[PDB]
Swiss-Prot record, chains A, B:
Guanyl-specific endoribonuclease which cleaves the phosphodiester bond in single-stranded RNA between the 3'-guanylic residue and the 5'-OH residue of adjacent nucleotide, resulting in the formation of a corresponding 2',3'-cyclic phosphate intermediate. Together with the P-granule component pgl-3, is involved in the formation of P-granules. Together with pgl-3, probably recruits other granule components such as pos-1, mex-3 and glh-1 to P-granules. The dimerization domain also acts as a hinge; changes in its structure probably impact oligomerization and RNA-binding. It is found in: Cytoplasmic granule. Methylated at arginine residues in the RNA-binding RGG-box by prmt-1. Methylation promotes P-granule degradation by autophagy. Residues 1-218 are annotated as: Involved in dimerization. Transmembrane segments: none annotated. The chain holds residues 215 to 447 of 730 of the full protein. This is Guanyl-specific ribonuclease pgl-1. Expressed in the germline. Expressed in most somatic cells.
Length: 218, 218
């Protein structure tokens, strides 16, 4: 049920609604940059995290190409701050990897999309990790002062959804930061249920697979 | 024993040597930015991480004010990328907190230095966390293609030192990201030895203390 602009636009996601929200956040960001310098920048932090909230939202509802459309609707000046440095270059792989892991937890070829080649680079790895991190704390913290469901029309299951997505992004971070060591294995104690079998089933159809199947048995 | 410029400058730290190294990294970064655009930026990633390596080095040898001097010897254009957004504003608190935890693990008033007020802000928290993260993976990854000791004149104990400092920064990250919950407690399984008692002894002299002493007993 609508009443305000932004809150009504924050409901169901499509190219239209999502695009509107993005542009209109980019406005706050824009005139922030046009006037109040560093203070404005401090605002731009939270604003960017709202953008990341939109991205994660696009990841959870199975709308990955929309997550890719997020980057297009953002001014380059804004993009320079929100995705600083190498982050803007590996954004595609971050979105792809995140979407893959998230959808796996919920229940394309990596070399073709260019994810593997990005994982070969340690710096691109770290950038991807930064982005996935941002994805995580974008739904962890209160981007909006008014609580808005990560998935529209699912208010009661909001904390469940958020916890799940968070754990998914956590395992993605594990993948990036540990691209079967003992120390690496100690960081898998976070898992709850169903996840391991989902890894098995997903990587069965898809040498990352090898490394993970090796890690699990240890 | 010296032979090259950079490698010889990468030895013992003082205002002179450290300053030289910083300026000279800032040169590579500079002419990178002056020509090869995005590729240059990709270089600027690793370069910035070398800068962070210098910062961590300044944290480990008990030279915190030098870590603060790092920021001064860096061009603003470079600073915009290396410390993007709110990171440049909370850099002081990141350096301070990191130094505190590191020196505690090895064996000033927080409200006065402004750390507590920064921890009150979730976005400043996240920024600090990003910086500490960068500190961690700056010593985790090979910033220089030639291995250079984190602490000069300590080559054999290099991996020991690195592991220790890494764990310190890890606990700092725990402090930032969990500013006595069950889920929060599960993230304390990383501890090895001596650390808990160091927390006790350090916070005994120093309501963060309260929250930690509460967490430990649970």
């Amino acid at each position: 049920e609508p009443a305000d602009p932004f809150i009504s636009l924050l409901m169901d996601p499509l190219e239209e609604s999502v695009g509107k929200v993005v542009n209109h956040i980019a406005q706050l960001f824009e005139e922030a940059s046009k006037n109040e310098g560093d203070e404005s920048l401090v605002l731009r932090s939270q604003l960017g995290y709202q953008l990341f909230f939109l991205i994660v939202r696009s990841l959870a509802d199975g709308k990955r190409e929309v997550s890719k459309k997020i980057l297009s609707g953002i001014p380059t000046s804004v993009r320079a701050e929100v995705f600083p440095g190498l982050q803007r270059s590996v954004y595609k792989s971050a979105v792809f990897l995140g979407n893959h892991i998230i959808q796996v937890l919920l229940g394309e070829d990596w070399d073709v999309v260019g994810v593997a080649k990005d994982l070969e680079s340690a710096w691109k790895r770290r950038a991807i990790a930064e982005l996935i991190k941002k994805f995580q704390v974008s739904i962890l913290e209160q981007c909006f002062d008014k609580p808005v469901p990560l998935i529209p029309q699912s208010p009661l299951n909001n904390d469940a959804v958020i916890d799940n997505v968070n754990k998914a992004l956590q395992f993605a971070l594990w993948l990036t930061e540990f691209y079967n060591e003992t120390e690496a294995l100690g960081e898998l104690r976070f898992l709850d249920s169903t996840s391991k079998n989902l890894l098995v089933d997903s990587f069965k159809k898809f040498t990352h697979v090898t490394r993970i199947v090796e890690s699990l048995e240890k």
